[PDB]
Amino acid sequence: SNLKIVRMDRTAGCVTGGEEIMLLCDKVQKDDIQIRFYEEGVWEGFGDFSPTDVHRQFAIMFKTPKYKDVNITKPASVFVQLRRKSDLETSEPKPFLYYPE
Amino acid sequence: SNLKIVRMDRTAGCVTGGEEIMLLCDKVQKDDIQIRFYEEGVWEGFGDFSPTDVHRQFAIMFKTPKYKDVNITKPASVFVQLRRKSDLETSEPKPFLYYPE
C-alpha cells in the first residue's frame, strides 16, 4: 500500500471536467504519481497537473471560534493569522468573513 | 517569517462559529501553533483543534479529466484512485460523481 487519498475538497464535477481540485494524500513522489478515474469493459481518464502543483505541507482541521457580536445583521470582515505559542511570531494575516446566522 | 497560510478551504463562516475548516500551511510544530482571529481596541478568538488534527502531507491541485459520455442526463458514479507510474501500484479507490452540465 502506502498510497492513500486522505482528502479531496470536491467529490463531484461536471462531465466536461477541467475543474480544479485539491487532493490531499500521504507520502508520494511528485513525478511518479497520477490520479486515475475509471469505471468498471474499462473506461479511464486522468487528472491534469504538474510536479510544481505537488508540495508537502501541514494540514490543520480546526473549528472556527465565535465572533464577539453574535447579533450582527451584516457581514463583519476580520483577520486570521498563524501564531507560534513560544515566541508569538505570526504570519501575514488573511481575510475572513463572518455572517449573521 | 516561515509561518504562512498556504490555503483555507473556507474563508467565511457564521458568527456562531464552531464550523470545521481545513487550513494548509508551511512548516509548523503541532503543539506550538495556533490560529488566531482578530479585529483591529482589539478583539480576538481562536480556532478549536488538537495536535492529532495536524499532520504533514502531500497536496495535489489538479484539474479533472472529462468523462467519456459528455451527453448524460443523469449523474454517473465512478472511481478515482492514485497510481504510481513506475510499478503501477494503486490506492484504495474512492467514489467520484460526474453530472451533466
Swiss-Prot record, chains A, B:
Superkingdom to which the source organism belongs: Eukaryota
Residue runs in coiled coils: none
Residue location of crosslink Glycyl lysine isopeptide (Lys-Gly) (interchain with G-Cter in SUMO2): 74
Cellular localisation: Nucleus; Cytoplasm
Modified residues (Phosphoserine): 86
Function: Constitutes the active form, which associates with RELA/p65 to form the NF-kappa-B p65-p50 complex to form a transcription factor. Together with RELA/p65, binds to the kappa-B consensus sequence 5'-GGRNNYYCC-3', located in the enhancer region of genes involved in immune response and acute phase reactions.
Protein name per the record: Nuclear factor NF-kappa-B p50 subunit
Organism: Mus musculus
Gene encoding the protein: Nfkb1
Residues of the full protein shown: 246 to 350 of 971
